[model samples]
Target: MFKGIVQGAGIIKKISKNDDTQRHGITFPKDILESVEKGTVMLVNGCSLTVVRISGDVVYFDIDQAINTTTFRELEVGNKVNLEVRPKGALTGNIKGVATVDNITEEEDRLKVYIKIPKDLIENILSEDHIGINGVSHSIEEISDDIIFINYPKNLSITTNLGTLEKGSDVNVETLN
Candidate 1:
């Protein structure tokens, strides 16, 4: 379970195969590391994962070989990942779609972003609704066909991966009720 509140963006430091699982090492921010420990459940790019090992500031997660078709399979070294520690007795949410970044505009103190949502998801969304992108919740500013507009405050630029998005970047989308 998660609340769609991203703690910070972590950098992928290493990737390796261990027996029947794919192991990944991600370097987390000091604050996130302080709150985490071995076995902590975390949301990574909207996917739930467990902290299998903690070495210094790097946390390790192992993706089982049986589940190889998720968005995480596309991750690589040096990539930035959205991270969030699962809250105690958290509420549940589903990743309803995977959106692609279309464009980004730097406003005075925030960013205006446009993303192409899956056709099926467009009909379910409306302006002013809350949507989770890369594990961080945001309100929909507007919607034009399959494209949805959202805003990211400047302070969130360093706390989540939204600020680092570019055209064609993939974002996990979760609709909040």
Candidate 2:
């Protein structure tokens, strides 16, 4: 189980193709890497992935080609991914939402982002409910039809991938347990 509380953003350091799977090396922040191990399950861009290898501050994961339909299809070296360590206990977290970026508007205090929610998932969300975007927990500011609005404070922008997202970006979403 994950808390939907992101530890921080990790930089993609390398990517290598091996047959049908791709190995990804991501450089994590010091504190986030401290407790990691070969079997540790971590959330990368909101997807729960197991650590395949650990070297220095970098952790590797081998992703299958079948992931090509998900947001991971757009990942590349140098891009930032939200990272979260699973909470210690029986697993409880599950990603239930997937959204597509529709628009982004920068406000004085926060960045207002509009994302198109999938029809099936929209019914599960509500205004003021806590939702996880790319592994970071956020409150639903509003919902207009299929579009959901979320606000990212300026400070959070420095710690997570939410700040650098662009229109047409795909994000993994989870409803907090």
Candidate 3:
């Protein structure tokens, strides 16, 4: 239930599906490495669990860990997870993975933009459709192994910074139905 944009692309150290009880802990932007404490119950990605130990970046718990749904999710550490930064929208489903690219790229016709997207979202994108590029509405000009294209001029105007981003930059994401 995240609302506004959260700053910093948090590293996904681990991903597991389980039920957590009450007394959960929240990790502030500070040195509190543990988001939930041991014996504390908390909900992560719609799953529940009781944090048994908060050792370093790993949280120990019971249950045959890392169990997602049938159409389950696959998440791992070092995978950059961008949470919305705004304060109020702090718990909407927007607290997912990197939905699209946060930077820009160049194309033959125009300066192309690749929405930093997860494998799940991009899998459904057709070659020449519309997908929200960095929360800015744009049509999907192309979809490659790690990139999407936006050829519209107006889109370039709005996403000024995207035109100059380097290889490791990031961008926001949304989808069009």
Candidate 4:
């Protein structure tokens, strides 16, 4: 069981295929690395990770498809995330919501993603509040009615499936309360 909210984040240093899972080497700050212990559960971004081993400033986590019914198949190296140590009996601190891809436009070097979120879900969300779309934490650059415009980054497109998302793609969303 892990304790406390996520106070840090890290970049995935390396990823290796491990059958149905991926062996990940993540580098975190010294404080975060020291706070983690073997066998404890840690929430990376919105993905729950178990403390497998710690080597220097890098931590090793065996990421599979069964960790809270999530997958790292779309994640890539060099992605930055926010993580927290979950409580003893909790799944996550990030509240779960749902959204769908409304549209996406790509330019030479810029990308814009439009998502239609639930009126009830984003009614109170401000423009500055960070929203996790499909576990990729992002801030809402613009909001009109129930539609949110996320300033899509090329890094996210190259790393995850966010760029390839078409209309009607269901996405997992979360907002820190």
Candidate 5:
């Protein structure tokens, strides 16, 4: 189970094809693939799906047609996504939505980031709490006066794509408890 924490960012449909069973195949970083077991449901970009099977870094999904309506259209080959495992019997389920990079500032080795989040879901976030952005778990520095800033450490920049984000770019975000 995940606490809205992202293990890493990976491309969906790294395989990108509907196979013999008419099911879609997806791939993940080694860590995520390792954590999940066959038949377990996972939160992929805010949507839920059960893993049909695993072969190396790939996982297949035998999904309902309705599954493609939201996340499927939102996802594209090479696009980044946030991956979170469902926490068993948890209150306040994971927060999943698109957040745009509104601004970014660099000071020596650290980065100050500001994001424009979905208006309706803004209240779900709190100051000093952690949120996952593009599959990287980050802490909220402030949440006031329409401000939503977070700090990005230099070490984290290399492990994830946080440093590559620019204004107008949309990222998948989730609230971490």
Candidate 6:
């Protein structure tokens, strides 16, 4: 388990991904982009990440998508996503909606599940309540309603794990409750 959260001044190198799944992606957050080179090995979030491709402002890496299903689901694997950027950096106040949680790892009381939705779905929710989507008890809130009108954008469409959701399966919903 090689890991290190080193915060060095890294620049956006390039971004890339697999044509099919695009499951594995990464960002070149190092100033010396060339140093990382193509196919360089790096550990991201404690996973064995390999620099497979690169694109402007970010680099792409290939890793186990299933293991990383929750963390960066809506984010492209190789785009330079800065944590300090505005809007994207500060989306705390507004966050709630119909989320398709991954494995509901629970044995008793509550099911521990994680979900990721588009900024669009961010609006559809108008209140927060423990409701059920399909069959899961998801927390829905009063989002902008944009999630209902407009569709999910590209990055979210391409990178998210929502597509993998079992259709007709219980997808938890949330509303004022």
Cα TM-score per model: 0.85, 0.88, 0.37, 0.54, 0.65, 0.30
Q: Which segments of candidate 5 are over 4 A away from where they belong?
A: 14-24, 43-48, 61-72, 82-93, 106-108, 123-126, 134-137, 175-177
Model 3 agreement with the true structure over 81-167: per-residue lDDT tens digits:
322221221232221334434455465546655555667776667776644333233467777775676665534433133343445
Query: For candidate 4, lDDT tens digit of each residue in 76-144?
Result: 797655556554223343435556779888877767888888777876777766777655666788888
Compare the candidates by TM-score and give the number of the best one: 2
**Per-residue alpha-carbon lDDT of model 1 for 84-126, expressed as tens digits?**
8876223243456678889998888989899999898888899
Clashing pairs in 1: none
All candidates' lDDT scores? Answer: 0.80, 0.80, 0.42, 0.66, 0.63, 0.34
Question: Per-residue lDDT for 156 in model 4?
Answer: 56
Greater-TM-score candidate between 4 and 6: 4
Q: Write the per-residue lDDT of candidate 6 for residues 129-168, one digit (tens) a residue.
A: 3433322223443333332211222232122222334322
Roughly what TM-score does model 5 have, to 2 decimal places? 0.65
- Give lDDT tens digits, candidate 5, residues 1-177: 444444466565644334322355666888777889899877665545678788888777664542333335444556555566665122132336667788988878888889987777687788877776654555788887555898887565544556666787666666654
Using lDDT as the measure, name the better of candidate 3 and candidate 5.
5
Q: State each model's C-alpha RMSD to the native.
A: 3.0, 2.8, 9.8, 7.3, 4.8, 14.6
Question: Backbone clashes in each candidate structure, one number apiece?
Answer: 0, 1, 30, 2, 0, 31
**What lDDT is obtained when candidate 5 is compared to the true structure?**
0.63
Ranking by lDDT: 1, 2, 4, 5, 3, 6
Candidate 2 clashes: the total is 1
Model 6 lowest lDDT segment of ten: 84-93
In TM-score terms, candidate 6 sits at: 0.30
C-alpha displacement of 23 in model 4, angstroms? 1.3
Regions of model 6 farther than 4 Å from truth: 1-3, 9-20, 23-32, 55-57, 63-70, 76-177
